[PDB]
Amino acid sequence: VCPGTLNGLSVTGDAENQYQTLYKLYERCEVVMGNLEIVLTGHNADLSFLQWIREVTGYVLVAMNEFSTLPLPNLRVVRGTQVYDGKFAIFVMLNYNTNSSHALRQLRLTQLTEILSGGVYIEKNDKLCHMDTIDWRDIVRDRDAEIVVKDNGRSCPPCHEVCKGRCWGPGSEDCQTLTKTICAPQCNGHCFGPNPNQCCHDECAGGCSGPQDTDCFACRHFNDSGACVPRCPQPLVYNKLTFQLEPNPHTKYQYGGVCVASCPHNFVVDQTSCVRACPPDKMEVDKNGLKMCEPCPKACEGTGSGSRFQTVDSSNIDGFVNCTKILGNLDFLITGLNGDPWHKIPALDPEKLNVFRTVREITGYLNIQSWPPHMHNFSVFSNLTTIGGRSLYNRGFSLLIMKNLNVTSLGFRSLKEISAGRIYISANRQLCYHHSLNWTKVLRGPTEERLDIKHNRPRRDCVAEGKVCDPLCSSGGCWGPGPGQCLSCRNYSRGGVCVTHCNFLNGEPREFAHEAECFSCHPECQPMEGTATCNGSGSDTCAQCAHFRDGPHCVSSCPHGVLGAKGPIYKYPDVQNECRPCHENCTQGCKGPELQDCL
Amino acid sequence: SHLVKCAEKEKTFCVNGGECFMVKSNPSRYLCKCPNEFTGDRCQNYVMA
Amino acid sequence: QVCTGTDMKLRLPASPETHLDMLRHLYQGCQVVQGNLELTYLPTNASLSFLQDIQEVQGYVLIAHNQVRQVPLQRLRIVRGTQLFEDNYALAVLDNGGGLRELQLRSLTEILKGGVLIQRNPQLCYQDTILWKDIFHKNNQLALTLIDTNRSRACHPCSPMCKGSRCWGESSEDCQSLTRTVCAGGCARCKGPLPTDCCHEQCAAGCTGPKHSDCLACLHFNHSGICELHCPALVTYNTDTFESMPNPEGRYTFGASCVTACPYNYLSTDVGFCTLVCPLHNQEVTATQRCEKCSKPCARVCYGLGMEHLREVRAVTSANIQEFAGCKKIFGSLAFLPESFDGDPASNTAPLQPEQLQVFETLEEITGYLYISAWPDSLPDLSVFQNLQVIRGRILHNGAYSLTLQGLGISWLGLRSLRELGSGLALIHHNTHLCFVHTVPWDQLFRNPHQALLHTANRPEDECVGEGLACHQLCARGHCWGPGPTQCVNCSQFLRGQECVEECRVLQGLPREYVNARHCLPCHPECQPQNGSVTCFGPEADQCVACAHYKDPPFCVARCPSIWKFPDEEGACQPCPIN
């Protein structure tokens, strides 16, 4: 199992680097989670590493190369979830040298059984043999799909006598196996034999070894612990005569093509299924352990695969005004800052990045490959508290910081959780303050194989130049130099900034302890010297009253002109500065409890 | 081969120093050959590791 | 096309005189019976031709205690057996002796669950000539058959055309067709012995071709002529992008078939099923009704008979009458039996009193049935339920009736607010003092093509005319629930509060009124009466033509409010000099 590609006909580097990239990516890969794109490969390339591929999720693209054979003898299922040109799941084009010295002559796809979506495009291949002798409608599932297979070969030999005119090559081991066009009239799909009792299950992708949902080669929808099913077990059982729905004692959730006992902690649960985000008519609601979708808030969507944009840019960044939670990924690429003249998109004003200072959660990944040359940190994301990781870069990555050559610190001072994925922070020649940071307090679960932080500013020079974070910070470290960028303070914080102590026994703005932070005492509280000033910020939590006492509360003066359950209320001060109600016949106040004391 | 260099306007298709090529074909098909450190259909992304 | 079955088993008809009409209305035009098909206690030569259209039965088929020679069920293909007759048996033919001579079940080739009873029928000849093993499904069954051969009749051999002697009756069209036990391979059903002639995996009873569109009956669900394992979901899931989205091709499940919208009287659900009750932790919500989840604690639910702790309770008695106090809607049925208003020494339960029945005064909606076979002899009507608007009929008495009145002493029906009988039949019979039944617009209360009123033995129409029992002269269509001006279905003049009247007190008298959409309502106490003209334009102190006492703009008042004002010589309030 490995990730696929999406480069189309483009390539990176020279002929040897194009091959080494292809080799390393697919070296022991059985299932390609994307496209299989083999473009401009040389005539002497060893492609035997592809022999283990059984299944392709997207399309198979083979173009403008010079190798003689395509060694995919085990590829059975091509799902076509992504389609080349919008039509074709297999695209084979121009695979020959213009001087005819080298060309592709054989596609070794002898086990290819089914294409679940899309057609077949095999065109312009002067030396490619046996393509008009393949019963391609036995393989292509969709009856409305386009099949070309035209200008391929000239003097090519016929199929071997044992193949009955249907083959992938000249040999007796090259014959095509027909699994759909020779079936019993009743079966609507692939078979394992010609009898009406020898047909494959409706949920199978490609062939099968028997008629059961556990004899199946691959599933079309969900795999329920070995059994292919159209849906996972539902919470309610329906009675066709009484029209009742009874609870199902054995339910499961739908998650990415497999049935699971419970939904992953970083996903939101819909009706029996786990999704990255809720439907347009639902919002995410926090429950016990898991999140759920319920019957909305602004649809502040992100960038990357599944969205309309590949990066934040001068025509996209305005969509995040007043955004607190981004659905999906947030990508910053070089073209997103410098501009993209191909689409008439101007360069981004560096100070428009301040629109992200209100974002507290990103449900996907954060990917920064470009940042303005005068911005030495990512303080624009100082308000970010969670990276959800429900959609990851390539596979596994939930945070990327690559080659930002003017950045000295990470920032993200409010960040408490990265719920899933891997961290890649590398090649940033100025980046220094990350070396002391303890990632097991930020990244959830085991971290032994998830933290990739190579190169950057050497730690030796970072400490030697005096870049170790403020001494007030505890073991675990900081996001930068300041006392406000620490994960946790040694003693107390004051508004999120680390301090040596609180103003408990002394200090004009007297304070009290609460949740390891310093908080001020009530304005009417009497300051203490040598003992605690207060136990809270309320009018009844102080050690002594600064002015006048009114029952349990301290006040600056006794109240006058107050309207309560019985109308106007007036109180007078006593010799000890205590407030008491005035006589029943007083007007606007009094000097005592008696009738003669009224004003 | 089967590829030719892109025209003065078309050379704008690819980014980050990549060289733009055309496939010789009724519809236009655009290629770019990226530097070793860049990938993606237009060379717009960095290569990891 | 689609209708429900009954729940009588072997019990007597509630009103024998209307029993054949009950069966006619329930089954006339049905192809699919979504319940048990019960044909019992029929007279000799009954008019049974309305049964010829039935092709499927969801539950059991019971034919018992009938004098008829034949039952026209030749088109019946499949009996699904969802409920069985006692347990064990899906087809039962019992005590039909006069009596049945032939089974005639020409099209029946499938029973999915249960066995067969054919017992004590001293006329029936063709119960031994059926290969019942070919009719039972391939799937695991009890498949038990108990066949009574004690017929005492000189039976004719079946037509020589019936090769192998398998037959439903004497005629050449009565030969049994064998569709499981005569075919090559492992196929559950077939057209013929050859390996090319098997039916599709989703076919039941048989087929006209090998495709899932060629079936005679669907084993699981029918989707617009196509037989499917599961009905298409309303909402789908993308395994590559981890998102859900609506299915443009999604359908609701309704019994054994798929529909585009959930049928009337059923609650829709987001999972795609149509039900009669909601799943646990939900609420019924109107739009047409749907079930929705209790995202906050569920509201008070007033349960009736047949639901939760009252499932085994026959009737409302002095022990459970209080459980309905303050309720607007009852989730269940109501039954008033001779034991409700009498004593029960088994638990020392007191009889209900007329003043205890008042607990239903607030009731507007019943989800089940209203069955009244006893009522106090001191109450001339059913006015205890005068505020009842809707009877849904989701639970039916004997599986057929939603409103039943038997043997009551009431002079007229008290149900003046009733506007809907959502499902089921109405049965009113043997009420010798009850006159106002023919005066009720029953065609405006029924909602379904299979509803009707069945009645007999009530007060004769000619005796009502003689005595003087008729609708009030102001009833809009000549339609009413009783003799009074408050009991009209609609009023030709004014509705006052709860009464139809000739005129509204707008132009003449002291207690003046105004008219609003044919309701006649009083003017504000501070409004001055206008002699020969309009008094007021509404119930408020600022809507009158003139002030009765002193003006306090915009309204009239008896005494000036504390700015403190006084009643001046102008006929209006003015600020006081004392402050």
Ligand SMILES: *[C@@H]1O[C@H](CO)[C@@H](O[C@@H]2O[C@H](CO)[C@@H](O[C@@H]3O[C@H](CO)[C@@H](O)[C@H](O[C@H]4O[C@H](CO)[C@@H](O)[C@H](O)[C@@H]4O)[C@@H]3O)[C@H](O)[C@H]2NC(C)=O)[C@H](O)[C@H]1NC(C)=O
């Ligand atoms: C799956 O469900 C579909 C409905 O979605 C169901 O289709 C209906 O089947 C019935 C018969 O099984 C069809 O009714 C007949 O159609 C023919 C068409 O020409 C008419 O000739 C028939 O009318 C004659 O018979 C009547 C009998 O009393 C006479 O009164 C009348 O005068 C005529 O002589 C009759 O209407 C019905 O048309 C279809 N509906 C559709 C839309 O096709 C289907 O059978 C179900 N399949 C399975 C396998 O369960």
Ligand SMILES: *[C@@H]1O[C@H](CO)[C@@H](O[C@@H]2O[C@H](CO)[C@@H](O)[C@H](O)[C@H]2NC(C)=O)[C@H](O)[C@H]1NC(C)=O
């Ligand atoms: C359904 O899922 C199961 C895993 O639960 C898959 O079984 C594994 O298949 C690989 C194939 O090489 C074997 O190496 C493993 O040993 C299998 N696991 C077990 C527990 O047997 C199965 O292949 C899937 N089936 C389909 C049809 O997709």
Ligand SMILES: *[C@@H]1O[C@H](CO)[C@@H](O[C@@H]2O[C@H](CO)[C@@H](O)[C@H](O)[C@H]2NC(C)=O)[C@H](O)[C@H]1NC(C)=O
């Ligand atoms: C980084 O953080 C982790 C998690 O807080 C620290 O691991 C904990 O260390 C204390 C030390 O006594 C143990 O009591 C806990 O049980 C540890 N937690 C877990 C989950 O193992 C770790 O010490 C910190 N520092 C470093 C350098 O890793």
Ligand SMILES: *[C@@H]1O[C@H](CO)[C@@H](O)[C@H](O)[C@H]1NC(C)=O
């Ligand atoms: C939302 O956006 C507008 C943009 O001008 C701004 O005026 C407003 O104050 C914003 N703030 C919040 C908190 O909604």
Ligand SMILES: *[C@@H]1O[C@H](CO)[C@@H](O)[C@H](O)[C@H]1NC(C)=O
């Ligand atoms: C972040 O960078 C800006 C300029 O890029 C600088 O003024 C500021 O002091 C930095 N903040 C910290 C905490 O280093």
Ligand SMILES: *[C@@H]1O[C@H](CO)[C@@H](O)[C@H](O)[C@H]1NC(C)=O
């Ligand atoms: C988010 O930004 C506002 C800006 O004033 C700030 O008050 C708030 O404390 C920040 N929240 C977090 C989680 O950092």
Ligand SMILES: *[C@@H]1O[C@H](CO)[C@@H](O)[C@H](O)[C@H]1NC(C)=O
């Ligand atoms: C009545 O029916 C049973 C059916 O098995 C049979 O055993 C019994 O001998 C019959 N005969 C008479 C004469 O009652």
Ligand SMILES: *[C@@H]1O[C@H](CO)[C@@H](O)[C@H](O)[C@H]1NC(C)=O
């Ligand atoms: C009452 O009956 C009359 C008869 O013509 C009709 O005009 C009026 O609309 C009816 N009112 C209601 C509420 O149905």
